[PDB]
Write an enzyme that holds these catalytic residues in place. Structure first.
Site, PDB file in Angstrom:
ATOM      1  N   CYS A  91      20.452 -23.062 -41.672  1.00  0.00           N
ATOM      2  CA  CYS A  91      21.765 -23.403 -42.185  1.00  0.00           C
ATOM      3  C   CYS A  91      22.654 -22.244 -41.808  1.00  0.00           C
ATOM      4  O   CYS A  91      22.234 -21.068 -41.894  1.00  0.00           O
ATOM      5  CB  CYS A  91      21.670 -23.587 -43.697  1.00  0.00           C
ATOM      6  SG  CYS A  91      23.183 -23.432 -44.562  1.00  0.00           S
ATOM      7  N   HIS A 133      21.271 -32.763 -45.317  1.00  0.00           N
ATOM      8  CA  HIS A 133      21.613 -31.308 -45.423  1.00  0.00           C
ATOM      9  C   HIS A 133      23.067 -31.061 -45.806  1.00  0.00           C
ATOM     10  O   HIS A 133      23.415 -30.259 -46.668  1.00  0.00           O
ATOM     11  CB  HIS A 133      21.316 -30.607 -44.107  1.00  0.00           C
ATOM     12  CG  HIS A 133      21.495 -29.118 -44.135  1.00  0.00           C
ATOM     13  ND1 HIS A 133      20.419 -28.243 -44.129  1.00  0.00           N
ATOM     14  CD2 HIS A 133      22.612 -28.354 -44.171  1.00  0.00           C
ATOM     15  CE1 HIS A 133      20.870 -27.003 -44.135  1.00  0.00           C
ATOM     16  NE2 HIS A 133      22.203 -27.046 -44.152  1.00  0.00           N
ATOM     17  N   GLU A 134      23.964 -31.708 -45.098  1.00  0.00           N
ATOM     18  CA  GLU A 134      25.388 -31.502 -45.332  1.00  0.00           C
ATOM     19  C   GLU A 134      25.879 -32.090 -46.655  1.00  0.00           C
ATOM     20  O   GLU A 134      26.811 -31.581 -47.270  1.00  0.00           O
ATOM     21  CB  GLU A 134      26.108 -32.167 -44.234  1.00  0.00           C
ATOM     22  CG  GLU A 134      25.811 -31.462 -42.939  1.00  0.00           C
ATOM     23  CD  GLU A 134      25.914 -29.942 -43.022  1.00  0.00           C
ATOM     24  OE1 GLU A 134      25.026 -29.274 -42.443  1.00  0.00           O
ATOM     25  OE2 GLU A 134      26.890 -29.385 -43.608  1.00  0.00           O
ATOM     26  N   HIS A 137      25.373 -30.047 -49.585  1.00  0.00           N
ATOM     27  CA  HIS A 137      26.274 -28.983 -49.740  1.00  0.00           C
ATOM     28  C   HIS A 137      27.357 -29.555 -50.541  1.00  0.00           C
ATOM     29  O   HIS A 137      27.942 -28.871 -51.331  1.00  0.00           O
ATOM     30  CB  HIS A 137      26.809 -28.573 -48.393  1.00  0.00           C
ATOM     31  CG  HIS A 137      26.071 -27.441 -47.714  1.00  0.00           C
ATOM     32  ND1 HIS A 137      26.002 -26.171 -48.226  1.00  0.00           N
ATOM     33  CD2 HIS A 137      25.509 -27.376 -46.490  1.00  0.00           C
ATOM     34  CE1 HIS A 137      25.283 -25.413 -47.420  1.00  0.00           C
ATOM     35  NE2 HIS A 137      25.015 -26.111 -46.333  1.00  0.00           N
TER      36      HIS A 137
HETATM   37  C1  LIG Z   1      19.106 -30.519 -39.477  1.00  0.00           C
HETATM   38  C2  LIG Z   1      19.820 -30.085 -40.726  1.00  0.00           C
HETATM   39  C3  LIG Z   1      21.352 -29.960 -40.415  1.00  0.00           C
HETATM   40  C4  LIG Z   1      21.640 -28.499 -40.029  1.00  0.00           C
HETATM   41  C5  LIG Z   1      23.072 -27.992 -40.308  1.00  0.00           C
HETATM   42  C6  LIG Z   1      23.158 -26.503 -39.816  1.00  0.00           C
HETATM   43  C7  LIG Z   1      24.595 -26.031 -40.047  1.00  0.00           C
HETATM   44  C8  LIG Z   1      24.911 -26.130 -41.541  1.00  0.00           C
HETATM   45  O1  LIG Z   1      24.589 -25.180 -42.236  1.00  0.00           O
HETATM   46  N1  LIG Z   1      25.482 -27.230 -42.048  1.00  0.00           N
HETATM   47  O2  LIG Z   1      25.662 -27.046 -43.343  1.00  0.00           O
HETATM   48  C9  LIG Z   1      22.687 -26.561 -38.329  1.00  0.00           C
HETATM   49  O3  LIG Z   1      23.340 -27.052 -37.387  1.00  0.00           O
HETATM   50  N2  LIG Z   1      21.461 -26.043 -38.212  1.00  0.00           N
HETATM   51  C10 LIG Z   1      20.746 -26.080 -36.994  1.00  0.00           C
HETATM   52  C11 LIG Z   1      19.422 -26.807 -37.307  1.00  0.00           C
HETATM   53  O4  LIG Z   1      18.926 -26.699 -38.455  1.00  0.00           O
HETATM   54  N3  LIG Z   1      18.921 -27.598 -36.272  1.00  0.00           N
HETATM   55  C12 LIG Z   1      19.616 -27.683 -34.936  1.00  0.00           C
HETATM   56  C13 LIG Z   1      18.879 -28.663 -34.029  1.00  0.00           C
HETATM   57  C14 LIG Z   1      17.513 -28.795 -34.714  1.00  0.00           C
HETATM   58  C15 LIG Z   1      17.668 -28.373 -36.204  1.00  0.00           C
HETATM   59  C16 LIG Z   1      16.456 -27.460 -36.568  1.00  0.00           C
HETATM   60  O5  LIG Z   1      15.151 -28.041 -36.238  1.00  0.00           O
HETATM   61  C17 LIG Z   1      20.495 -24.695 -36.387  1.00  0.00           C
HETATM   62  C18 LIG Z   1      21.546 -24.490 -35.240  1.00  0.00           C
HETATM   63  C19 LIG Z   1      20.342 -23.503 -37.363  1.00  0.00           C
HETATM   64 ZN   LIG Z   2      24.000 -25.772 -44.384  1.00  0.00          ZN
END
Ligand SMILES: CCCCC[C@H](CC(=O)NO)C(=O)N[C@H](C(=O)N1CCC[C@H]1CO)C(C)C
Ligand SMILES: [Zn+2]
Ligand SMILES: [Zn+2]
Ligand SMILES: [Zn+2]
Ligand SMILES: [Zn+2]
Ligand SMILES: [Zn+2]
EC number: 3.5.1.88
Length: 181
Positions: A91, A133-134, A137
């Site tokens: 996150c 996830h979002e 929040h």
């Molecule tokens: C999947 C749950 C949604 C994640 C949202 C987060 C960003 C965030 O904190 N939103 O609140 C993000 O893009 N996280 C990425 C993430 O968790 N991902 C990106 C692609 C795959 C998946 C991890 O397996 C990475 C860039 C840290």
């Molecule tokens: Zn997050």
């Protein structure tokens, strides 16, 4: 703009239903999206930018000119899937912290769009994993609240580093503490 990091209480604060769909809203939508692409993520909620509104931007591909650009205001989960899948999450508000959380595989969602109109979109696979996830929040739920006791203990120390950084920038004891759970 800035990214509100755990343990900032904004991430926990109640989030205001949106009633007005004006130009300001579109501008803020634009900024979230562009912060998502700057920081290479697949979604973003308003609290993460310091605003306690029921707002979330979303691109399943997480790449510019790829996937789709989904806006959901005042969303609500009409229902979760019976099946549960684990999966690895990080996150933005928890820099460099990654670990597993298990979730319903799919979701029926009802939100409004950026105009005012009320829709009902069903999600699965990575989109439904991101949405959830979002949307947590949007509720002041952070992904480590979704983690098992065992998964939480690996990241205890790194969560603490954030509490201490927060304590270092503010002076105020951290307003919440992983050790508390
Ligand atoms: C999947 C749950 C949604 C994640 C949202 C987060 C960003 C965030 O904190 N939103 O609140 C993000 O893009 N996280 C990425 C993430 O968790 N991902 C990106 C692609 C795959 C998946 C991890 O397996 C990475 C860039 C840290
Ligand atoms: Zn997050
Ligand atoms: Zn800034
Ligand atoms: Zn833009
Ligand atoms: Zn990318
Ligand atoms: Zn401790």
């Amino acid at each position: 703009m800035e990214i509100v990091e755990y343990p900032d209480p904004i991430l926990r604060a109640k989030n205001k239903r949106i009633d007005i769909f004006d130009e300001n809203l579109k501008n803020l939508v634009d900024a979230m999206f562009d912060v998502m692409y700057k920081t290479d993520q697949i979604g973003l909620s308003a609290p993460q930018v310091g605003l306690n509104v029921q707002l979330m931007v979303f691109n399943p591909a997480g790449e510019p000119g790829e996937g789709k650009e989904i806006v959901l205001v005042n969303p609500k989960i009409k229902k979760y899937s019976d099946k549960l899948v684990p999966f690895d999450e990080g996150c933005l508000s928890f820099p460099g912290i990654y670990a597993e959380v298990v979730r319903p595989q799919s979701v029926k969602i009802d939100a409004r769009d950026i105009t005012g109109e009320r829709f009902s979109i069903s999600l699965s696979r990575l989109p439904a994993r991101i949405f959830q996830h979002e949307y947590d929040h949007l509720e002041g739920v952070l992904f480590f609240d979704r983690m098992t006791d065992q998964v939480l203990d690996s990241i205890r120390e790194e969560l603490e580093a954030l509490e201490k950084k927060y304590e270092e920038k503010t002076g105020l004891p951290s307003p919440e503490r992983v050790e508390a759970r």
